[PDB]
Amino acid sequence: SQIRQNYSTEVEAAVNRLVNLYLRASYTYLSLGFYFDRDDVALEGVCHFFRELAEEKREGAERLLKMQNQRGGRALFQDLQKPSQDEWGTTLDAMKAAIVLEKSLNQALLDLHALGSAQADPHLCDFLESHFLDEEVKLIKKMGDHLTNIQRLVQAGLGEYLFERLTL
Amino acid sequence: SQIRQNYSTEVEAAVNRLVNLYLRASYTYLSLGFYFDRDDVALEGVCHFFRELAEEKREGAERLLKMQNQRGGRALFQDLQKPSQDEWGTTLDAMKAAIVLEKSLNQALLDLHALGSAQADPHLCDFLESHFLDEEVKLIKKMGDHLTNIQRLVQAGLGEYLFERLTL
Amino acid sequence: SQIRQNYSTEVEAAVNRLVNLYLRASYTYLSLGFYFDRDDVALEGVCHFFRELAEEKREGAERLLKMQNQRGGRALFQDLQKPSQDEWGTTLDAMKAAIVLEKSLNQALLDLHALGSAQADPHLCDFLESHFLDEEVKLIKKMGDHLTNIQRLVQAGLGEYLFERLTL
Amino acid sequence: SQIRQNYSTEVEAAVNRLVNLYLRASYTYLSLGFYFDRDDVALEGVCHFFRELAEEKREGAERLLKMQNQRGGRALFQDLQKPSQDEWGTTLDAMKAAIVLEKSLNQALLDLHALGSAQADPHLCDFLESHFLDEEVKLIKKMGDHLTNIQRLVQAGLGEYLFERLTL
Ligand SMILES: *CC(F)(F)OCC(F)(F)F
Ligand SMILES: *CC(F)(F)OCC(F)(F)F
């Protein structure tokens, strides 16, 4: 590419992998959201919480793709695997799966940062530090807070209703 | 001091002690607030309640310091001891510790008032009666009200959540 | 902590130390401010300059504490030592002590950054670079500018009055 | 008087004396103000400072007279002695005389408070504490601040001009 400068093939490939990860995460949240929209689950605040996250993760993928083109890398898309579950259980079960998912995204961001440091790619470093790293830390904190409140409320049916009504 | 009039050394020293007490109280509320911000505690209304009190106590210290200078006394600062606990337990535990703290501040205000009366210092009397005594009485009443509601709600996890959501 | 990821015990402890440093700095500026409010010193612009800095340093401590909780670290508070002086001399003396204080905070920030780099903690790096490092550089520059103007003005009483009136 | 209750003859007489003192003080400030309006003195900010105080002291007398009637006491007016000087020297000389004057008013307020305490007259106590005691403390502090700045500026002609221009 005529514009490519200081952009390693290793980072280019890792950015493509991270896009697949973010799109996978968006798909997982789409599934979570619609599960809570089921007439036999029916927790609107939980559905909305996850649908909002689906959007956020899709936007993350799009930010990575824009950056890939800015650096003169080439987007390569792969199959997107279906979410790990078809049914997500209680709000607690779902929030547990969500924090696991966010930690995996966070670790992937940290790995990419490490790669960028190794390749002396300060533009990549800044990009991740600016658009991703703190967003992830904040989200994981919020999920931790929710998990604690969910667990304090477990009795169980009453707690799930109240959390959806009064927190979400 | 060129401006000093009817301002005893005993009151000057007691005012300095009271400043240390108010700053200690601010520090204790800072600790309480951040404890409730922990991801494994996560009671936002409780955190906000105590952070607001940290501010109020700091402002009290500043009011005392301004008055000290107005009277021609000299501010003398001492080490500030760390709060009595690192972890504050339940909302109930915390509110109990808070009312204990406020009663100690109140007693210190009353002792200073008594000292002012003994020294026939009506400006000091007015200062305390105007800026501190009723504020303390009102705060202690509010904490008493909270304690009663907390105790009525104790089961326990559900009660703590509901109090934070619906009162704080 | 359920949320903790890539957050070393070394950084957690250093963050706690830095909180103590910032609170110490706030206390030092509180003392500086009220000294200049003395009827026998009476430099209102100087008092306001330092009282504003007390607030800024307290806010820095609070930012560090919020971050500590975001990362799943645990705030640990220690005794706060009293400021190094009870009386602060001239505006020049005070500004000299202030720049010494800011340089020590700056060095502590740089040490923490180095620690973060060694622990490959890019979130910490970004946090410090975003909220602290440039604020410190700007503040130290402003103090340097003031010192130069103060020194140019030293005769002495006239210079101190004019600097307070026309710069502060 | 049909309305008189718990109002001693001693307090009634002391209130009349205090009125004479406040009117004397107003007259002294009138003289100070017009001295600084002299073409051979010509310090407008100083003239305005003292003319404002003349008004404040007259208003104090009027407040005391209103209170006297509220309590069913009887106003008794006496000759008003002329101010202690015809010419007031420098700004420094004048401010020195002003702080002496304010301290004498303050002492008179404190004596009246003591008298009220001895006569168990809480309405009088409140009246003085509310309308006079803190006003006096604040004024004396401000004069102390001015004296310090004046003295720092003394060379002499330049200092007097600058203080009038930049503080008053
Ligand atoms: C965000 C989600 F995965 F759901 O959607 C991805 C795509 F299919 F591209 F819309
Ligand atoms: C900022 C200062 F140190 F002054 O205050 C600290 C605390 F005591 F916590 F208010």
XYZ file of C-alpha atoms and ligand atoms in Angstrom:
692
model
C 0.000 0.000 0.000
C 1.144 3.529 -0.945
C 0.249 4.772 2.551
C 1.576 1.897 4.682
C 4.309 2.930 7.150
C 5.519 1.170 10.303
C 2.570 -1.244 10.116
C 3.679 -4.835 10.577
C 2.054 -7.875 8.942
C 1.762 -9.351 12.462
C -0.346 -6.430 13.696
C -2.400 -6.395 10.472
C -3.268 -10.073 11.018
C -3.966 -9.609 14.756
C -6.287 -6.677 13.954
C -8.228 -8.979 11.584
C -8.489 -11.581 14.346
C -9.696 -8.956 16.827
C -12.413 -7.873 14.365
C -13.694 -11.479 14.258
C -13.645 -11.521 18.088
C -15.656 -8.278 18.340
C -18.207 -9.436 15.757
C -18.503 -12.782 17.650
C -19.087 -10.774 20.842
C -21.780 -8.656 19.118
C -23.513 -11.874 17.982
C -23.329 -13.341 21.505
C -24.988 -10.184 22.909
C -27.654 -10.262 20.190
C -28.493 -13.817 21.359
C -28.449 -12.809 25.040
C -30.761 -9.841 24.337
C -33.369 -11.825 22.444
C -33.339 -14.622 25.030
C -34.446 -12.081 27.683
C -37.193 -10.915 25.254
C -38.748 -14.450 25.366
C -42.291 -14.462 26.804
C -41.144 -17.139 29.316
C -38.149 -15.055 30.453
C -39.471 -11.506 29.996
C -36.863 -9.247 31.619
C -36.955 -6.084 29.519
C -34.102 -4.227 31.307
C -31.829 -7.253 30.838
C -32.749 -7.524 27.166
C -31.964 -3.818 26.714
C -28.636 -4.099 28.607
C -27.425 -6.808 26.226
C -28.849 -5.300 23.028
C -26.922 -2.087 23.837
C -23.735 -4.176 24.240
C -24.324 -5.874 20.852
C -24.262 -2.420 19.316
C -21.127 -1.360 21.232
C -19.212 -4.470 20.121
C -20.250 -4.029 16.482
C -19.048 -0.423 16.684
C -15.726 -1.654 18.079
C -15.316 -3.942 15.065
C -16.087 -1.037 12.737
C -13.519 1.188 14.522
C -10.877 -1.544 14.042
C -11.786 -1.895 10.370
C -11.546 1.877 9.789
C -8.129 1.886 11.501
C -6.970 -1.102 9.387
C -7.695 0.901 6.215
C -6.128 4.085 7.697
C -2.876 2.176 8.187
C -3.017 0.533 4.767
C -3.770 -2.934 6.084
C -6.335 -5.144 4.379
C -9.520 -6.349 6.092
C -9.947 -10.116 5.892
C -13.212 -11.499 7.171
C -13.718 -15.026 8.458
C -16.719 -17.137 9.395
C -18.442 -15.965 12.539
C -19.139 -18.757 14.977
C -22.508 -18.942 16.683
C -22.703 -18.035 20.418
C -21.679 -20.693 22.948
C -25.259 -21.166 24.210
C -28.819 -21.105 22.808
C -30.424 -20.398 26.214
C -28.779 -18.238 28.856
C -30.489 -19.169 32.139
C -30.908 -16.556 34.844
C -29.774 -12.912 34.823
C -26.942 -14.070 37.058
C -25.913 -16.841 34.589
C -25.997 -14.324 31.725
C -24.004 -11.637 33.566
C -21.406 -14.316 34.492
C -21.075 -15.298 30.808
C -20.869 -11.612 29.856
C -17.977 -10.859 32.240
C -16.128 -13.968 30.915
C -16.653 -12.639 27.383
C -15.434 -9.128 28.280
C -12.318 -10.477 29.997
C -11.484 -12.461 26.835
C -11.881 -9.284 24.715
C -9.777 -7.365 27.252
C -7.026 -10.021 27.117
C -7.102 -9.879 23.317
C -6.685 -6.056 23.506
C -3.764 -6.458 25.923
C -2.127 -9.076 23.657
C -2.480 -6.737 20.686
C -0.990 -3.888 22.737
C 1.960 -6.113 23.658
C 2.417 -6.993 19.975
C 2.313 -3.275 19.073
C 4.947 -2.500 21.728
C 7.161 -5.324 20.389
C 6.785 -3.900 16.857
C 7.381 -0.324 18.081
C 4.029 0.818 16.637
C 3.046 3.826 18.761
C 0.049 4.701 16.567
C -1.483 1.281 17.358
C -0.694 1.755 21.051
C -2.471 5.116 21.128
C -5.415 3.757 19.162
C -6.004 0.923 21.648
C -5.340 3.075 24.726
C -7.723 5.760 23.452
C -10.670 3.709 22.103
C -10.667 0.330 23.837
C -8.638 -0.210 27.004
C -10.494 2.145 29.352
C -13.895 1.295 27.822
C -13.187 -2.361 28.640
C -12.003 -1.618 32.206
C -15.161 0.503 32.839
C -17.473 -2.157 31.405
C -15.915 -4.996 33.418
C -16.228 -2.837 36.615
C -19.938 -2.238 35.869
C -20.515 -5.980 35.303
C -18.680 -6.777 38.551
C -20.968 -4.271 40.351
C -24.041 -5.909 38.791
C -22.855 -9.419 39.699
C -22.409 -8.357 43.305
C -25.935 -6.865 43.433
C -27.497 -9.819 41.652
C -25.803 -12.218 44.104
C -26.884 -10.149 47.123
C -30.482 -10.410 45.856
C -30.670 -14.215 45.370
C -35.825 -15.238 47.280
C -34.508 -15.864 43.721
C -37.460 -14.853 41.497
C -38.136 -11.780 43.627
C -34.440 -10.790 43.462
C -34.274 -11.133 39.665
C -37.414 -9.028 39.189
C -36.200 -6.300 41.574
C -32.759 -6.058 39.963
C -34.288 -5.677 36.494
C -36.789 -3.074 37.756
C -34.513 -1.019 40.020
C -31.026 -1.274 38.481
C -31.600 -2.076 34.783
C -1.989 39.921 66.558
C -3.087 43.518 65.838
C -6.704 42.357 65.470
C -6.957 39.903 68.383
C -9.591 40.855 70.987
C -11.305 38.685 73.606
C -9.853 35.548 71.991
C -8.312 33.241 74.570
C -5.301 30.972 73.984
C -7.478 28.101 75.276
C -10.089 28.631 72.555
C -7.389 29.151 69.899
C -5.876 25.768 70.814
C -9.278 24.019 71.005
C -10.178 25.403 67.555
C -6.944 23.864 66.193
C -7.876 20.534 67.778
C -11.380 20.709 66.296
C -9.887 21.316 62.829
C -7.861 18.087 63.183
C -11.069 16.291 64.258
C -13.025 17.565 61.228
C -10.225 16.665 58.804
C -10.026 13.178 60.437
C -13.797 12.874 59.940
C -13.482 13.908 56.261
C -10.797 11.222 55.788
C -12.980 8.590 57.490
C -15.861 9.436 55.108
C -13.528 9.335 52.099
C -12.605 5.766 53.154
C -16.252 4.807 53.750
C -17.254 6.177 50.319
C -14.593 4.320 48.371
C -15.272 1.073 50.244
C -18.876 1.154 48.928
C -17.455 1.792 45.410
C -15.652 -1.621 45.554
C -16.861 -4.047 42.856
C -17.541 -6.621 45.632
C -19.618 -4.147 47.674
C -21.139 -1.978 44.929
C -23.720 0.206 46.692
C -23.647 3.465 44.743
C -26.151 5.398 46.928
C -24.128 4.515 50.039
C -20.885 5.578 48.377
C -22.495 8.897 47.402
C -23.938 9.445 50.917
C -20.474 9.165 52.464
C -18.587 11.065 49.752
C -20.993 13.996 50.310
C -20.210 13.842 54.058
C -16.440 13.889 53.352
C -16.999 17.173 51.565
C -19.183 18.600 54.361
C -16.574 17.778 57.025
C -13.742 19.290 54.973
C -15.848 22.436 54.576
C -16.362 22.517 58.348
C -12.590 22.446 58.856
C -12.187 25.288 56.363
C -14.886 27.352 58.147
C -13.012 26.871 61.453
C -9.727 27.881 59.834
C -11.262 31.041 58.324
C -12.709 31.930 61.748
C -9.321 31.294 63.437
C -7.721 33.890 61.134
C -10.680 36.308 61.569
C -10.065 36.278 65.322
C -6.298 36.600 64.974
C -5.548 33.068 66.107
C -2.924 30.979 64.340
C -3.724 27.725 62.522
C -1.533 24.842 63.662
C -1.872 21.621 61.732
C -1.063 18.180 63.097
C -0.722 14.715 61.609
C -4.004 13.258 60.457
C -4.562 9.725 61.655
C -5.904 7.134 59.252
C -9.542 5.959 59.696
C -10.248 3.329 62.360
C -11.061 0.629 59.775
C -9.913 -0.424 56.280
C -13.167 -2.287 55.492
C -16.554 -1.124 56.728
C -18.825 -4.184 56.496
C -22.510 -3.734 55.763
C -24.449 -0.490 55.231
C -25.710 -0.990 58.770
C -22.139 -1.365 60.161
C -21.075 1.780 58.285
C -24.070 3.874 59.392
C -23.410 2.754 63.010
C -19.775 3.916 62.729
C -20.952 7.170 61.127
C -23.365 8.033 63.963
C -20.577 7.279 66.511
C -18.310 9.647 64.567
C -20.952 12.406 64.408
C -21.674 12.148 68.135
C -17.941 12.579 68.847
C -17.859 15.707 66.620
C -21.029 16.967 68.327
C -19.486 16.435 71.788
C -16.357 18.276 70.656
C -18.569 21.202 69.482
C -20.390 21.216 72.832
C -17.071 21.157 74.743
C -15.822 24.089 72.677
C -19.082 25.957 73.335
C -18.661 25.346 77.071
C -15.081 26.645 76.857
C -16.317 29.745 74.985
C -18.972 30.371 77.659
C -16.323 30.014 80.403
C -14.110 32.524 78.549
C -17.062 34.872 77.908
C -16.460 34.734 74.134
C -19.867 35.467 72.592
C -18.488 35.658 69.039
C -17.320 32.023 69.335
C -20.690 31.034 70.803
C -22.561 32.592 67.882
C -20.174 31.062 65.363
C -20.750 27.530 66.685
C -24.502 27.999 67.186
C -24.871 29.392 63.660
C -22.633 27.065 61.590
C -22.281 23.775 63.453
C -24.661 22.898 66.283
C -27.908 22.617 64.312
C -26.163 21.033 61.300
C -24.889 18.314 63.651
C -28.295 17.777 65.318
C -29.970 17.484 61.855
C -27.334 15.061 60.568
C -27.506 12.804 63.635
C -31.362 12.741 63.314
C -31.058 11.703 59.639
C -28.571 8.935 60.540
C -30.882 7.736 63.329
C -33.747 7.609 60.775
C -31.554 5.622 58.366
C -30.434 3.204 61.096
C -34.046 2.519 61.998
C -34.957 1.818 58.345
C -31.869 -0.288 57.739
C -32.648 -2.360 60.859
C -36.307 -2.785 59.860
C -35.101 -4.156 56.500
C -32.646 -6.816 57.788
C -33.712 -10.998 54.231
C -30.373 -9.146 54.695
C -29.042 -8.819 51.117
C -32.490 -7.891 49.817
C -32.879 -5.265 52.579
C -29.492 -3.662 51.860
C -30.223 -3.441 48.128
C -33.699 -1.953 48.683
C -32.468 0.672 51.151
C -29.747 1.819 48.743
C -32.212 1.909 45.820
C -35.223 3.481 47.548
C -33.786 5.730 50.281
C -30.237 6.587 49.134
C -11.309 -9.634 42.773
C -13.699 -10.938 40.082
C -12.773 -8.008 37.818
C -8.996 -7.871 38.353
C -6.959 -8.430 35.164
C -3.341 -7.512 34.408
C -3.172 -5.440 37.607
C -0.042 -6.205 39.597
C 0.237 -6.099 43.400
C 3.230 -3.764 42.906
C 1.135 -1.200 41.024
C -1.766 -1.588 43.484
C 0.600 -0.756 46.363
C 2.273 2.131 44.480
C -1.168 3.600 43.685
C -1.962 3.535 47.433
C 1.320 5.320 48.147
C 0.580 7.935 45.479
C -2.836 8.592 47.066
C -1.098 9.347 50.392
C 1.293 11.680 48.518
C -1.571 13.575 46.834
C -3.516 13.914 50.094
C -0.292 15.149 51.809
C 0.083 17.687 48.984
C -3.550 18.834 49.418
C -2.896 19.325 53.157
C 0.302 21.289 52.447
C -1.646 23.618 50.107
C -4.434 24.018 52.671
C -1.755 25.219 55.138
C -0.146 27.518 52.550
C -3.547 29.043 51.674
C -4.552 29.812 55.241
C -1.121 31.249 56.060
C -1.657 33.889 53.327
C -5.120 34.594 54.849
C -3.417 35.702 58.134
C -4.093 39.368 58.987
C -0.293 39.891 59.263
C 0.355 38.355 55.824
C -2.838 39.287 53.957
C -2.178 38.364 50.317
C -5.580 37.294 49.011
C -4.447 36.263 45.484
C -1.743 34.038 46.996
C -4.216 32.469 49.410
C -6.580 31.762 46.500
C -3.769 30.315 44.323
C -2.911 27.754 47.002
C -6.484 26.963 48.065
C -7.249 26.117 44.405
C -4.224 23.766 44.383
C -5.441 22.041 47.586
C -8.621 21.215 45.715
C -6.761 20.001 42.602
C -4.553 17.656 44.650
C -7.525 16.236 46.564
C -9.240 15.602 43.225
C -6.112 13.802 42.009
C -6.271 11.498 45.035
C -9.942 10.805 44.331
C -9.179 10.013 40.655
C -6.511 7.508 41.790
C -8.927 5.927 44.259
C -11.654 5.569 41.601
C -9.104 3.955 39.256
C -7.923 1.586 42.036
C -11.497 0.289 42.407
C -11.991 0.141 38.597
C -9.002 -2.198 38.368
C -10.077 -4.291 41.348
C -7.326 -3.060 43.639
C -8.050 -2.219 47.264
C -7.617 1.276 48.723
C -5.454 1.296 51.842
C -5.206 4.576 53.683
C -2.326 5.592 55.925
C -1.692 8.416 58.367
C -1.300 11.773 56.693
C 1.717 13.689 57.900
C 1.395 17.375 58.674
C 2.996 19.888 56.239
C 6.741 20.520 56.546
C 6.242 24.083 57.849
C 3.773 26.004 60.052
C 4.683 29.408 58.548
C 5.607 29.866 54.902
C 7.470 33.193 54.736
C 7.223 35.330 51.622
C 5.317 34.613 48.394
C 8.695 33.721 46.926
C 9.459 31.245 49.774
C 6.018 29.663 49.327
C 6.259 29.379 45.526
C 9.731 27.783 45.949
C 8.270 25.192 48.355
C 5.358 24.626 45.960
C 7.598 23.877 42.954
C 9.646 21.451 45.136
C 6.382 19.740 46.104
C 5.163 19.519 42.487
C 8.474 18.074 41.292
C 8.212 15.361 43.975
C 4.654 14.519 42.802
C 5.874 14.541 39.188
C 8.750 12.168 40.048
C 6.300 9.880 41.845
C 4.088 9.863 38.692
C 7.120 9.053 36.526
C 8.177 6.234 38.895
C 4.668 4.788 38.751
C 4.709 5.037 34.945
C 8.036 3.184 34.875
C 6.564 0.499 37.149
C 3.525 0.210 34.841
C 5.802 -0.169 31.798
C 7.815 -2.876 33.612
C 4.555 -4.698 34.443
C 3.217 -4.225 30.889
C 0.105 -2.438 32.208
C -1.006 -0.199 29.331
C -4.245 0.832 31.064
C -2.192 2.349 33.919
C 0.103 4.045 31.400
C -2.842 5.653 29.611
C -4.451 6.672 32.890
C -1.330 8.531 34.057
C -0.568 10.027 30.633
C -4.162 11.240 30.282
C -4.941 12.608 33.780
C -1.661 13.510 35.469
C 1.526 13.857 33.428
C 0.596 16.884 31.313
C -1.283 18.556 34.195
C 1.931 18.324 36.234
C 4.146 19.644 33.401
C 1.745 22.617 32.877
C 1.596 23.404 36.597
C 5.378 23.289 37.060
C 5.777 25.624 34.000
C 3.290 28.097 35.540
C 5.146 28.010 38.887
C 8.466 28.545 37.085
C 6.911 31.579 35.316
C 5.676 32.936 38.661
C 9.059 32.393 40.336
C 10.763 34.333 37.568
C 8.306 37.249 37.927
C 8.466 37.219 41.710
C 12.289 37.290 41.566
C 12.300 40.112 38.998
C 10.107 42.132 41.393
C 12.226 41.785 44.578
C 11.789 46.955 46.665
C 10.606 43.686 48.310
C 7.279 44.671 49.936
C 6.265 46.676 46.873
C 7.145 43.728 44.590
C 5.123 41.228 46.643
C 2.064 43.498 46.669
C 2.266 44.164 42.912
C 2.641 40.482 42.015
C -0.405 39.549 44.105
C -2.447 42.422 42.621
C -1.407 42.146 38.964
C -0.641 38.448 38.386
C -2.630 36.566 41.060
C -44.158 50.576 79.151
C -47.060 48.203 78.375
C -44.736 46.020 76.277
C -41.624 45.977 78.487
C -40.617 42.485 79.678
C -37.263 41.245 80.988
C -35.608 44.509 79.909
C -33.434 45.942 82.659
C -32.835 49.656 83.291
C -29.093 48.864 83.146
C -29.347 47.496 79.601
C -31.672 50.340 78.542
C -29.059 52.870 79.703
C -26.140 50.946 78.138
C -28.033 50.785 74.818
C -28.391 54.598 74.939
C -24.654 54.916 75.577
C -23.871 52.569 72.681
C -26.041 54.699 70.364
C -23.935 57.763 71.277
C -20.784 55.700 70.578
C -22.035 54.602 67.135
C -23.098 58.137 66.183
C -19.658 59.415 67.365
C -18.055 56.737 65.170
C -20.194 57.796 62.169
C -19.070 61.415 62.708
C -15.408 60.353 62.947
C -15.727 58.496 59.609
C -17.476 61.477 58.009
C -14.426 63.578 59.003
C -11.973 60.929 57.764
C -13.806 60.686 54.412
C -13.840 64.407 53.722
C -10.187 64.783 54.738
C -9.234 62.342 51.934
C -11.418 64.419 49.541
C -9.127 67.470 50.149
C -7.366 68.653 46.968
C -4.022 68.378 48.848
C -4.726 64.787 49.952
C -6.839 63.496 47.050
C -7.177 59.746 47.646
C -10.623 58.909 46.287
C -10.646 55.190 47.266
C -9.734 56.123 50.850
C -12.442 58.779 50.975
C -14.980 56.226 49.711
C -13.817 53.554 52.211
C -14.472 55.898 55.135
C -17.689 57.441 53.795
C -19.109 53.895 53.482
C -18.147 53.256 57.136
C -19.892 56.488 58.243
C -23.061 55.077 56.740
C -22.585 51.643 58.354
C -22.095 53.171 61.818
C -25.148 55.421 61.455
C -27.163 52.350 60.458
C -25.885 50.555 63.563
C -27.160 53.412 65.731
C -30.540 53.236 63.999
C -30.721 49.442 64.548
C -30.040 49.989 68.279
C -32.705 52.690 68.454
C -35.297 50.464 66.736
C -34.455 47.655 69.188
C -34.730 50.062 72.167
C -38.312 50.891 71.127
C -39.107 47.199 70.401
C -38.184 46.363 73.994
C -40.057 49.330 75.444
C -36.947 51.248 76.432
C -36.710 54.988 75.860
C -34.125 56.588 73.560
C -32.146 59.334 75.278
C -29.806 61.325 73.094
C -26.728 63.162 74.322
C -24.311 65.656 72.814
C -22.101 64.164 70.147
C -18.454 65.017 70.594
C -16.407 66.071 67.595
C -13.817 63.588 66.203
C -10.448 63.359 67.969
C -8.572 64.953 65.040
C -9.174 67.628 62.372
C -6.513 66.227 59.998
C -5.806 62.520 59.657
C -2.327 62.288 58.104
C -1.483 59.395 55.815
C -3.691 56.458 54.786
C -1.684 54.434 57.284
C -2.348 56.965 60.109
C -6.064 56.947 59.256
C -6.360 53.144 59.075
C -4.550 52.925 62.460
C -7.080 55.353 63.993
C -9.922 53.400 62.367
C -8.855 50.044 63.855
C -8.529 51.723 67.306
C -12.068 53.066 66.865
C -13.465 49.672 65.794
C -11.823 47.893 68.730
C -13.456 50.401 71.111
C -16.876 49.734 69.497
C -16.197 45.986 69.681
C -15.294 46.239 73.391
C -18.470 48.236 74.009
C -20.489 45.465 72.255
C -18.764 42.813 74.382
C -19.444 44.802 77.583
C -23.107 45.104 76.626
C -23.238 41.361 75.904
C -21.739 40.661 79.335
C -24.345 42.954 80.916
C -27.113 41.124 79.009
C -25.795 37.750 80.220
C -25.697 39.055 83.820
C -29.312 40.254 83.448
C -30.375 36.985 81.767
C -31.641 38.879 78.696
C -31.397 36.358 75.848
C -33.188 38.631 73.360
C -30.408 41.230 73.790
C -27.774 38.505 73.444
C -29.272 37.297 70.165
C -29.654 40.844 68.877
C -25.963 41.638 69.425
C -24.735 38.242 68.198
C -26.868 38.526 65.054
C -26.364 42.183 64.015
C -23.085 43.405 65.491
C -20.524 40.927 66.812
C -19.596 39.182 63.557
C -19.828 42.420 61.534
C -17.260 43.923 63.920
C -14.942 40.877 63.779
C -15.078 40.922 59.924
C -14.411 44.663 59.749
C -11.454 44.533 62.152
C -9.973 41.608 60.097
C -10.310 43.669 56.886
C -8.620 46.679 58.540
C -5.820 44.428 59.825
C -5.353 43.120 56.244
C -5.229 46.696 54.920
C -2.746 47.794 57.600
C -0.450 44.930 56.675
C -0.593 45.850 52.959
C -0.172 49.554 53.625
C 2.881 48.832 55.816
C 4.391 46.481 53.215
C 4.082 49.310 50.661
C 5.809 52.104 52.653
C 8.775 54.566 48.602
C 5.991 56.156 50.726
C 4.094 58.334 48.208
C 4.257 55.598 45.575
C 2.975 53.021 48.102
C 0.028 55.192 49.179
C -1.009 55.834 45.570
C -0.756 52.141 44.620
C -2.769 50.960 47.628
C -5.570 53.426 46.862
C -5.562 52.462 43.161
C -5.210 48.679 43.468
C -6.897 47.751 46.767
C -9.391 50.569 47.465
C -23.053 -7.621 16.101
C -23.513 -8.916 15.391
F -22.593 -9.872 15.502
F -24.628 -9.336 15.986
O -23.801 -8.657 13.987
C -22.689 -8.864 13.064
C -23.172 -8.724 11.625
F -23.579 -9.905 11.162
F -22.169 -8.308 10.852
F -24.187 -7.852 11.596
C -6.637 18.013 50.682
C -6.424 17.868 52.206
F -5.321 17.168 52.468
F -6.276 19.089 52.718
O -7.579 17.237 52.829
C -7.517 15.784 52.951
C -8.702 15.277 53.766
F -8.389 15.249 55.060
F -9.004 14.033 53.393
F -9.740 16.097 53.568
